[PDB]
Chain A
Amino acid sequence: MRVRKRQSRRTSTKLKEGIKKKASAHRKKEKKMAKK
């Protein structure tokens, strides 16, 4: 048939090392909420 698009696992940089850089900040938020 017309077998559909395959989405990558390439480098494609946003996600990866910069977003859960912020999610390390989310672990900071976890510490901030654990006080309550």
Chain B
Amino acid sequence: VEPVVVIDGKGHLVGRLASVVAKQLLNGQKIVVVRAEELNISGEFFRNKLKYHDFLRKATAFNKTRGPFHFRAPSRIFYKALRGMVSHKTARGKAALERLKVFEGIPPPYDKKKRVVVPQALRVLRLKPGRKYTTLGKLSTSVGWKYEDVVAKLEAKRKVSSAEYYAKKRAFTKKVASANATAAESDVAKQLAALGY
């Protein structure tokens, strides 16, 4: 429906987000993803770390400079397990992934913009309670992403500036809501109340 969609990757699941992201791509909704270090995976840390090490040991026997790249950072993990879902070798693939832009944290301009989610991939919904999961930021930090303390800091700055925004917006919407309330019990409003507004 929109030109652009801006996903928060928090409390989310890699496979089940990758899937919908792929289909929305190949139907043509340009997508950006952010906060991928707040992402999550089913299964415990040790399981996911061993799944990563078994990939890690796989390179070309004779020359590693051409062989598989064991990318570390979380956005690139999500991109890995998305380009497995699309035909990157073709041109339709490459012209899908020229619609995908994946980041950590929320850099600009997107921090001022509307973050969304996907309910059919959330952890809290699409898992049972009383069950494990792994934080991707911690996993990447445990296999050599050397950056985790920094996105923390910038997330702090964005959080405080957004809370200071939220105060203003809450006050202003309080004012307009009080105004519309005072605008109530007036026939110009009562007609709309009859017609569902």
Contact = CB atoms under 8 A, between A and B. Distances in A.
State yes or no: do A and B touch (Cβ within 8 Å). yes
Interface of A: 3, 6
Contacts, number: 5
B52 to A, nearest CB: 10
5 contacts: A3-B50, A3-B53, A3-B54, A3-B57, A6-B54
A35 B57 CA distance: 55
Interface of B: 50, 53-54, 57
Give 5 nearest A-B pairs by CB, closest first: A3-B53, A3-B50, A6-B54, A3-B54, A3-B57
Nearest to A2: B57
Contacts of B53: 3
A6 B57 CA distance: 11
A33 to B, nearest CB: 45
Contacts of B54: 3, 6
Nearest to A1: B53
Contacts of A6: 54
Contacts of A3: 50, 53-54, 57
Nearest to B57: A3
Nearest to B49: A3
